[PDB]
């Protein structure tokens, strides 16, 4: 339910890789072909595919929560709802005073 959030950078530097047997025929060409796909952006494009694109919280990665400088309108509502609640109760007593 998109209730988590990555804060701060990374503590350490590590990475994944593709492994081949020592002296294997397909060792260097794949090592070269990986550098080809990283520079051609195919790595970060596929990274963006199964993570953000096909991800279920594609919207939970664009909005930002910042320290608002102003005061909330909601807390002030508790006062406006008790003021008009008195202005309305006031006009109810004006009619009983105009007849007596």
């Amino acid at each position: 339910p998109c209730d988590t959030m990555k804060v701060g950078g990374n503590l350490d530097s590590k990475g994944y890789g593709i492994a081949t047997p020592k002296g294997s025929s397909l060792g260097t060409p794949v090592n070269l072909a990986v550098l080809k796909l990283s520079e051609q952006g195919v790595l970060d494009k596929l990274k963006n595919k199964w993570w953000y694109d096909k991800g279920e919280c594609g919207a939970k990665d664009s909005g930002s929560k910042e320290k608002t400088s102003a005061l909330s309108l909601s807390n002030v509502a508790g006062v406006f709802y008790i003021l008009v609640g008195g202005l309305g109760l006031a006009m109810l007593v004006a009619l009983i005073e105009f007849c007596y």
Partner: protein
């Protein structure tokens, strides 16, 4: 209902076809045993995992999120890193609480 390489989808499945596009080889997608990683026993000194199936001949190449470590480098040949990462912090993002009367 599917069969072969269409059964599995994900980052590596598309990475496999793209690696097989700039090196051209018929690749068969197989799942390692019991979701294993690269580790070495202290008593028996027996390797297990995707790294294990590369030194024992049961496979030709391993493409997966495999942490590049020194104990794994002395036994197999790691390619260049295709995904950088690091230990991070996860906190439940709050502040969705709504003030009321």
């Amino acid at each position: 209902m599917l069969e072969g390489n269409e059964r599995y989808e994900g980052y590596c499945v598309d990475l496999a076809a793209e690696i097989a596009k700039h090196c051209g080889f018929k690749y068969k997608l197989t799942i390692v045993g019991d979701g294993k990683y690269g580790a070495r026993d202290a008593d028996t000194k027996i390797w297990n995992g995707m790294v294990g199936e590369l030194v024992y001949g049961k496979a030709d190449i391993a493409i997966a999120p495999l942490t590049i470590t020194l104990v794994r480098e002395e036994v197999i040949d790691f390619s260049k890193p295709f995904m950088s990462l690091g230990i991070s912090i996860m906190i439940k993002k709050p502040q969705k609480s709504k003030p009321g009367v």
